[PDB]
A paper describes a structure:
In gram-positive bacteria, PCATs function both as maturation proteases and exporters to secrete quorum-sensing or antimicrobial polypeptides. PCATs are typically homodimers; each subunit consists of a transmembrane domain (TMD), a nucleotide-binding domain (NBD) characteristic of all ABC transporters, and a unique C39 cysteine peptidase (PEP) domain essential in recruiting the substrate. The [name] substrate, [name], is a small protein consisting of a 24-residue leader peptide followed by a 66-residue cargo peptide.
To obtain a stable [name]-[name] complex, we used a proteolytic-deficient mutant (C21A) that can bind but does not cleave the substrate. Next, we determined the cryo-EM structure of the [name](C21A)-[name] complex in the presence of excess [name] and in the absence of ATP. Consistent with the native MS analysis, two copies of [name] were bound to a single [name] transporter. In this ATP-free, substrate-bound conformation, the TM cavity is continuous with the cytosol and closed off to the extracellular space. The two PEP domains, each binding a [name] molecule, interact with the transporter core at the TMD/NBD interface. Residues 8–25 of the leader peptide form a L-shaped structure that wraps around the PEP domain, with the N-terminus in the cytosol and the C-terminal end at the lateral opening of the translocation pathway. The double-glycine motif (G23 and G24), inserted to the active site of PEP, interacts with catalytic residues C21A and H99. For the other substrate, the non-translocating [name], no density is observed beyond S26, two residues beyond the double glycine motif. Comparing the structures of [name] in the presence and absence of [name] shows that in the substrate-bound conformation, the intracellular opening of the TM cavity (formed from TM3 and TM4) is approximately 3 Å wider and the two NBDs are further apart.
Numbering used by the authors:
A (entry chain C): 8 to 30
B (entry chain A), C (entry chain B): 8 to 722
D (entry chain D): 8 to 26
Write the structure that this text describes.
């Protein structure tokens, strides 16, 4: 490990990226 | 172990691809649609908790670490997932493989594999690390199957057509190679000795051969068209049917266009399987027969023709990647422009109101300039490819004529033989050109096949349930909830521990603050979703034991955001239930007060309506919804006033309907306005996904709870 | 006088085309966009009253007649406008030209000209006749200009590039014709006498000629790309700028996609003019030079080659129309399928709820089968065209070789001369093929040119006004309305005779029943539209005399359906006003309570917002609207609670803002709920586009008017 | 003329490109 650990809320706060495409 | 990167089939699924990529890296190939379902990829995006839960479910021992600027510490096992930021626009998930002295290897699921300088990446990334490691429970396997072979099944019934196309193509080729020897017979025999009768006969002979050749081409062209359409129809319809059988979870997860992109995908996969079936069958032999004939004619000229093909092969293969990279970069920059134009047009009221007509134009111009730049770069690559293919083809033609004439002068071959060789190149180069121009199609096809097949492997709604319908035929009874917790994906639970009690044939009202939790509690009761913790009892029997068909057929759900499909009003009113007599429909229609606006229609019952009832006003629309509901003759009637105006002209007609019910059937109303529900028997208050207080209006006001404060805040 | 038919450029404009067609028939050519503006073509459709008014405005004496089944009666003016029904789906307008004994000639603006049997048409049509006749005031003219010549203006600055492309193409052709004589020199001279040194020299000579030819092609290809992009950018940006300068009337009339279709056809205009200009320049000479060279070589073989071109010309010209008819029919049937799929996907909740999974599939299958049938018919026509072109080309090649050999045997030309002739066909057929394959592009180009140019000829918003801004600098004063009637198009007037009186620096409320008339009365005050009957006075000065710039800059309009463009929050908050200090923005931001959610965004102020603030909550989005409004520091603040939820968490923040205004500036609130407005000074009741009663709450309740009944209906 | 007359309302009732 040897890194700054986070709470279960902060894990729920991190969000993934969309991208643009044809429609 | 070499670095593995999983590509994004959809736009939203970023973290799912990263977890799948690491899962593959350690040696566990799993369907990406299943991992998407595990991680709980909502339309918004993927929560790191969702990834950690999904990893922990696969048996990977993993933790979510706040990124440290000093990531140079030895004991931080890779591969690790770190969420970067794409050019300060959107959050993105990316897979770290090896942090070297200063270069970081990152197998970006958005775009292949890339390597960033420590300082650059460190500027790009938010920093949110997810460290994974297999801990005994993890097992190596291969759970995905080759869907390209699964989709080959539709070619089994059309054996005759394929074989007929194969014979037609073979015989076309044979008449082609036979027909190409005309110039030889012309220059060598006929013109030398100046024979006329023979010339006149041979000319007609080759003319008739060509007329039979173009006739076989015509016949083949018709059969390949019919085969193509047939497989295209089969795949498209097979996919569509499977999608409808999936649970609401699938449709909540994805967007609309995200599902229909699959139809265009299906159109592209069909093309590839058809091409692969035919080309390999009719070109791998055609090229060989041609090559043999050339090798027989002259060795030197054949080996020159081989070099021409080899060089063409190398030029196409080296230019294949950058064109696709430029193409993707154009489609991105074009999608932003068209999005900007729509955004600019939708709110011209605002732009006009603020006098920002100059800035939006300057903004649009910059986005057009960007598209022009991207277009030009792709154009330049096509020009470069075209030019080099041009050089090879032309110099190939000239050098073959040079070598030919040299070999003729030396007396190796005759004159006309060179022209016959020049003619046969048409039947040798074309096949191998077509064979080399297939690799990009196959690659994008296998992508499409996997993209489509992953959805076809998902477990249908019917298969996820086991029932005991013969034990309870009727629904009618007391509806109660026990400890019913609910969460849409892997996020904050919308409903915590809940306890309800709905007695048979009483107008019970559910009021609250959050519209989502309120509408969710209805959608749950119909068993669209299933609560993780708790259960729901109708008449002292678990809903999970009752038939899906009966449940949905016996419960009416009237939403304020009603949907109307383009058809005839009459047919639209009784959708899903055929062999329904008009005499019922007209009796039901009255209860909604359909008639009043129905009579003003050109056709009473057969009037055609605009997409999403564009020509129909909201007040009339909902009456079509109530008419649809009352036609069902249900045991539970679930009303909604959620995301409504409440004009107070419809409330009277709703009361007229609710009085018109005239049965011992339960009515559940979900209206945020307290003025409408005061007359109801039991008013349940939903507060932060918890029922706080329950009972009659008078009792709730008398108790002076949260309801009293809300009612005093009303008036 | 021959029958004239005007085509539909947009979907909705049916009656406009019919009136324009008759207007042309009598000999008055007028821009269709102007007639669209005259008739008042709303997004719904065209009212026959709108057509009659538009006709009466042109000076045509016309009347609306209820269709009589007996229309074979002589003395009814022809032609006449009769509204038919397209396959019992939508209402359509069509132009009757001549009712013969049993056949009726109808020049359908949807699809060219058609002739129906009396009994058939009589079944199709609703029957609603509009009979027109010129009555002195009508005058023959030509008011449309050729927009194809107007768009040629952008080719004036790029003279050098065009001339450079022309020289490059000319010199390419010259080296082409020079390079095509290799086979002659090979077969006639070099191979006969078996010269090696000369062969080795000539081979290199022709090789170097080809290398210079492909280099000129490369240089031309770059210049034609640059020219194309440059004109494409110019036209697209010229159109976009003009659209923004048009009044709100233009944007109310048309849809979104209806405006961007012009952007998509700007490409094909440019593409057509650019291609056509270059083709005529470089092919009409190339074909002539080629033809001369062939006519010099041998007359018989040239006249055979002429017949080949003639037959190809006839086959393409005869097949040009049905392909376009099939193409249109496919695009229709495809548009219905994709619409049906979206409709089916949007409301799967309903389909699942009703268990109608079978019917929707059967419906979709029938729509796929329809598309397959249409696709197959177009495929068949392409196969037929391909085959016949195949026959001509191949028989042409064989018969030329036959005739050639015959002429060689007779000793008219040498051997190699025939192969040189066969080589030169490449440089004779290609130009005339390319020249014949241009007529469909030109025809669709002239359509697009007119479609685009008609919009570019519309009168901009600025030009429709004359002002006196130096006479009144400030706005601040009593706002009053005098006899202000208003109608959107040529339909029922939304507002009849109105009289208002808004005193300076008082929170006046406008409540009503119809949301449209309420929001219209705000949009009118800003002078987006102009009322036909009545006028509006600010500070005892007509709005028509005040500067448009100052009016829109000094009035803030806060709608509940707020729009947010994708950018940085900070930039998005102060759109239209640059050189604005952050110190103001942060002071304004506080008043809306932006900070509270702004601090929790990943980046404080430079957060990249999602399309239409999708990620941002509705409540959050509103606060940005108020922050945008308060930044303006206006003299009038127009609020809207129209088509709202009113969660009652925002009302507090609206009150916080309205108290925070802290000036002698007028606030106009438009909230349907009476609970919010009770505290206001003067409550105006809008009833059926009429102000019935005005004054304070207490006085209005004390008077016991319509307000009392509504207030008692509230609680 | 010689046809059944219409009211200015029913002229406003007839629609083109609508349902």
């Amino acid at each position: 490990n040897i890194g700054r650990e986070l709470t279960d809320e902060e894990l729920m706060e991190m969000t993934g990226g969309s991208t643009f495409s044809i429609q | 172990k070499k670095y593995v990167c999983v590509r994004q089939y959809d736009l939203t699924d970023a973290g799912a691809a990263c977890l799948s990529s690491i899962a593959q890296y350690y040696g566990l190939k799993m369907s990406l649609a299943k991992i998407r379902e595990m991680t709980g990829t909502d339309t918004q995006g993927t929560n790191a908790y969702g990834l950690i839960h999904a990893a922990k479910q696969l048996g990977f021992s993993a933790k979510g670490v706040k990124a440290s600027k000093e990531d140079l510490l030895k004991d931080f096992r890779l591969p690790a997932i770190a969420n970067v930021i794409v050019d300060n626009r959107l959050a993105h998930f990316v897979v770290i493989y090896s942090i070297k002295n200063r270069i970081i290897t990152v197998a970006d699921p958005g775009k292949g594999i890339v390597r960033y300088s420590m300082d650059d990446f460190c500027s790009i990334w938010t920093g949110g690390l997810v460290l994974l490691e297999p801990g005994e429970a993890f097992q190596k396997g291969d759970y995905t199957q080759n869907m390209m072979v699964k989709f080959a099944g539709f070619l089994k019934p059309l054996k005759k057509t394929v074989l007929c196309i194969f014979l037609a193509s073979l015989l076309y080729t044979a008449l082609g190679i036979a027909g190409s020897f005309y110039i030889k017979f012309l220059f060598d025999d006929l013109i030398k000795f100046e024979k006329l009768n023979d010339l006149h006969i041979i000319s007609a002979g080759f003319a008739v051969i060509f007329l039979l050749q173009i006739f076989l081409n015509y016949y083949r062209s018709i059969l390949v068209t019919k085969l193509g359409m047939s497989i295209d129809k089969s795949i498209m319809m097979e996919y569509y049917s499977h999608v409808l059988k999936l649970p609401m979870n699938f449709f909540n997860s994805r967007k609309v266009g995200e599902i229909i992109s699959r139809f265009m995908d299906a159109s592209k996969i069909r093309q590839a399987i058809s091409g692969a079936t035919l080309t390999i069958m009719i070109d791998t032999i055609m090229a060989v027969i041609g090559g043999i004939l050339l090798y027989i004619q002259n060795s030197s000229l054949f080996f020159i023709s081989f070099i021409i093909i080899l060089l063409y092969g190398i030029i196409v293969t080296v230019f294949n990647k950058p064109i696709q990279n430029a193409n993707r970069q154009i489609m991105e920059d074009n999608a932003k422009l068209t999005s900007a134009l729509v955004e600019s047009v939708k709110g011209i009221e605002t732009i006009k109101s603020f006098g920002a007509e100059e800035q939006t134009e300057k903004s649009t111009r910059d986005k057009i300039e960007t598209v022009m730049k991207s277009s030009f770069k792709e154009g330049m690559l096509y020009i470069n490819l075209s030019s080099l293919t041009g050089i090879v083809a032309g110099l190939g033609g000239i050098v073959i004529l040079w070598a030919g004439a040299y070999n003729v002068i030396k007396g190796n071959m005759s004159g006309g033989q060179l022209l016959a060789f020049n003619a046969l190149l048409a039947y040798f180069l074309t096949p191998v050109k077509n064979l080399i121009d297939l690799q990009p199609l196959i690659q994008t096809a296998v992508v499409a096949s996997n993209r489509l097949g992953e959805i076809l492997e998902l477990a249908t709604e019917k298969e996820l349930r086991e029932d005991s319908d013969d034990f309870v035929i009727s629904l009618k009874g007391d509806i109660e909830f026990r400890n019913v917790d609910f969460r849409y994906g892997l996020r904050k639970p919308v409903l915590k521990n809940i306890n309800l009690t709905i007695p048979k044939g009483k107008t019970v009202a559910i009021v609250g603050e959050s519209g989502s939790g309120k509408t969710t509690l209805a959608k749950l009761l119909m068993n669209f979703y299933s609560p993780e913790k708790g259960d729901i009892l109708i008449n002292g029997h678990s809903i999970k034991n009752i038939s899906l068909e009966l449940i949905r057929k016996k419960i009416a759900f009237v939403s304020q955001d009603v949907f109307i499909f383009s058809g005839t009003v009459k047919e639209n009113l009784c959708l899903g239930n055929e062999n329904v007599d008009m005499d019922e429909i007209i009796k039901a229609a009255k209860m909604a007060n359909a008639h009043d606006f129905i009579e003003k229609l050109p056709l009473k019952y057969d009037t055609f309506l605009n997409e999403s009832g564009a020509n129909l006003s909201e007040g009339q629309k909902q009456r079509l919804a109530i008419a649809r509901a009352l036609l069902k003759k249900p045991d539970i009637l679930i009303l909604d006033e959620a995301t409504s105006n409440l004009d107070s002209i419809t409330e009277n007609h709703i009361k007229d309907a609710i009085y018109g019910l005239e049965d011992d059937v339960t009515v559940i109303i979900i209206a945020h306005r307290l003025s409408t529900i005061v007359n109801c028997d039991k008013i349940y208050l939903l507060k932060d996904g918890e029922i706080v207080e329950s009972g009659s209006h008078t009792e709730l006001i008398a108790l002076k709870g949260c309801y009293f404060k809300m009612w005093k805040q009303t008036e």
